[PDB]
């Protein structure tokens, strides 16, 4: 099952995981935000987390500023298990001031379509 940990430019830390025991093609994932206050133990100070549906498998995580506040949003990209390989994605805001919140969702994109463009249009 997918698991990845990323340090944000703010020093906060995020993990992204697929749900345990779930099938490959469908289920959920979660995003968990930590303060990262102690770099020796970056998952020691949990702040918030969210669980979302996934229509496929997590393909990649991106950190990119979508709203223009010069801080990156987290984008979780998911690839359909069907032959069409359609992409979906959720974007999240995450910062020390406000915490962790969803920002947008897209789905049904062709394999090679720009997910970031779709989330900004």
């Amino acid at each position: 099952g997918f698991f990845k940990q990323l340090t944000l430019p703010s020093g906060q830390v995020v993990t992204v995981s697929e749900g345990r025991g779930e099938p490959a093609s469908t289920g959920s994932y979660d995003v968990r935000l930590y303060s990262g206050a102690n770099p020796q133990f970056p998952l020691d100070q949990f702040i918030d987390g969210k669980v979302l549906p996934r229509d496929g498998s997590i393909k990649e995580l991106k950190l990119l500023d979508l709203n223009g506040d010069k801080q990156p949003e987290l984008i979780v990209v998911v690839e359909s298990a069907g032959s069409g390989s359609y992409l979906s994605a959720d974007a999240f805001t995450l910062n020390p001031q406000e915490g962790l919140d969803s920002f947008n969702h897209v789905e049904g994109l062709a394999p090679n379509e720009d997910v970031i463009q779709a989330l900004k249009t």
């Binding site: 099938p23 490959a24 093609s25 469908t26 229509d55 496929g56 498998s57 393909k59 690839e79 359909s80 298990a81 069907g82 032959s83 069409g84 390989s85 359609y86 789905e107 049904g108 394999p111 090679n112």
Partner: protein
């Protein structure tokens, strides 16, 4: 093809749609491989019960690959609310466990029915 809840004509039409019904090997799109007669990816093979010795070997066999499709539909189609006929099964095949409920697979179904002998296939 393997027997199960999907009809033989429907499987043939899906096969023709995906590959012209040929063992085309594995092709890369977005760093992800899709293989064989039915263009099955690893996640699909895992969920269809891992028939055969491995994903790529199964995908290259008309029988094993179609068994995988049969098992995938048995696992997912009913419970997604799909019609249990080719419109449903084709759209699951193209779109995953809820493909039959997603607009992204409508064109696939419309086009699949243009293949000779596949109009209104059940």
């Amino acid at each position: 093809f393997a027997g199960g809840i999907v009809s033989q004509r429907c499987l043939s039409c899906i096969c023709k749609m995906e590959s012209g019904c040929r063992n085309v090997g594995c092709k890369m799109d977005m760093g992800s491989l899709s293989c064989g007669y039915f263009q099955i990816k690893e996640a699909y093979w895992i969920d269809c019960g891992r028939p055969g010795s491995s994903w790529k070997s199964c995908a290259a066999s008309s029988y094993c690959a179609s068994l995988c499709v049969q098992n995938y539909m048995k696992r997912y189609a009913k419970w997604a609310g799909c019609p249990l006929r080719c419109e449903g099964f084709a759209r699951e095949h193209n779109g995953g466990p809820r493909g039959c409920k997603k607009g992204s697979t409508i064109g696939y179904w419309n086009r699949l029915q243009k293949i000779s002998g596949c109009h209104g296939v059940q």
